[PDB]
Design a protein around this motif. Structure first.
Motif, PDB file in Angstrom:
ATOM      1  N   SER A  64       0.847  -1.222   0.000  1.00 40.73           N
ATOM      2  CA  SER A  64       0.000   0.000   0.000  1.00 40.73           C
ATOM      3  C   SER A  64       0.872   1.257   0.000  1.00 40.73           C
ATOM      4  N   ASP A  65       2.195   1.103   0.107  1.00 43.14           N
ATOM      5  CA  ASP A  65       3.161   2.220   0.296  1.00 43.14           C
ATOM      6  C   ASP A  65       4.594   1.675   0.169  1.00 43.14           C
ATOM      7  N   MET A  73       3.754  -2.171   4.533  1.00 41.90           N
ATOM      8  CA  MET A  73       2.348  -1.767   4.682  1.00 41.90           C
ATOM      9  C   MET A  73       1.556  -2.416   3.548  1.00 41.90           C
ATOM     10  N   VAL A  74       0.475  -3.073   3.922  1.00 47.77           N
ATOM     11  CA  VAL A  74      -0.349  -3.855   2.966  1.00 47.77           C
ATOM     12  C   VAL A  74      -1.818  -3.522   3.195  1.00 47.77           C
ATOM     13  N   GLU A  75      -2.615  -3.735   2.153  1.00 44.71           N
ATOM     14  CA  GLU A  75      -4.076  -3.800   2.307  1.00 44.71           C
ATOM     15  C   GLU A  75      -4.637  -5.005   1.548  1.00 44.71           C
ATOM     16  N   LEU A  76      -5.898  -5.287   1.821  1.00 39.73           N
ATOM     17  CA  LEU A  76      -6.614  -6.448   1.250  1.00 39.73           C
ATOM     18  C   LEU A  76      -7.335  -6.039  -0.026  1.00 39.73           C
ATOM     19  N   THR A  91       1.183  -7.507  -5.452  1.00 41.36           N
ATOM     20  CA  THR A  91       0.744  -8.657  -4.620  1.00 41.36           C
ATOM     21  C   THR A  91       1.940  -9.236  -3.859  1.00 41.36           C
ATOM     22  N   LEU A  92       1.812  -9.422  -2.543  1.00 42.64           N
ATOM     23  CA  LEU A  92       2.815 -10.138  -1.710  1.00 42.64           C
ATOM     24  C   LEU A  92       2.425 -11.613  -1.591  1.00 42.64           C
ATOM     25  N   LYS A 108       6.640 -10.278   7.322  1.00 45.47           N
ATOM     26  CA  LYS A 108       6.283  -9.184   8.266  1.00 45.47           C
ATOM     27  C   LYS A 108       5.499  -8.135   7.489  1.00 45.47           C
ATOM     28  N   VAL A 109       4.282  -7.850   7.929  1.00 46.67           N
ATOM     29  CA  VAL A 109       3.401  -6.854   7.268  1.00 46.67           C
ATOM     30  C   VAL A 109       2.838  -5.923   8.334  1.00 46.67           C
ATOM     31  N   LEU A 110       2.523  -4.719   7.903  1.00 46.12           N
ATOM     32  CA  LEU A 110       1.750  -3.736   8.692  1.00 46.12           C
ATOM     33  C   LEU A 110       0.393  -3.635   8.013  1.00 46.12           C
ATOM     34  N   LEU A 111      -0.634  -4.241   8.608  1.00 46.94           N
ATOM     35  CA  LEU A 111      -1.948  -4.378   7.929  1.00 46.94           C
ATOM     36  C   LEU A 111      -2.784  -3.139   8.211  1.00 46.94           C
TER      37      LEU A 111
END
Length: 113
Positions: A64-65, A73-76, A91-92, A108-111
């Motif tokens: 996401s960034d 930083m990730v989003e769904l 996509t990760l 490791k993700v920041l959701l």
């Protein structure tokens, strides 16, 4: 908090016992978010031949960034019959329930919650 530091177990697609989160875009996004909160969510890295082995609708984590404390930083974003619900970066991997499969690695993700 708007973001949560998570460490997602990376699973081999052939080990995964429960190959999706449900039957509608709204359900899979709901269930993915619940399993992420409950620490019961795995990640499969997407390569040739992986997605046809999993159940649609799919839930992706997408960057996401461009990464606090090592956490990307990730989003769904969900996908059903080639349409995506959400707009984000690279996509990760694809999220699945984790029911005790042995991981090969952690992501490791920041959701964004």
């Amino acid at each position: 908090k708007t973001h949560v530091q998570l460490s997602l177990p990376v699973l081999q697609v052939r080990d995964v016992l429960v190959r999706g989160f449900g039957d509608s875009v709204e359900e899979v996004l709901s269930e993915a978010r619940q399993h992420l909160k409950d620490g019961t969510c795995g990640l499969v890295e997407v390569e040739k031949g992986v997605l046809p082995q999993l159940e649609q609708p799919y839930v992706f984590i997408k960057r996401s960034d461009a990464a606090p404390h090592g956490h990307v930083m990730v989003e769904l974003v969900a996908e059903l019959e080639g349409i995506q619900y959400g707009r984000s970066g690279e996509t990760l991997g694809v999220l699945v329930p984790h029911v005790g499969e042995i991981p090969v690695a952690y992501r490791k993700v920041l959701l964004r919650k």
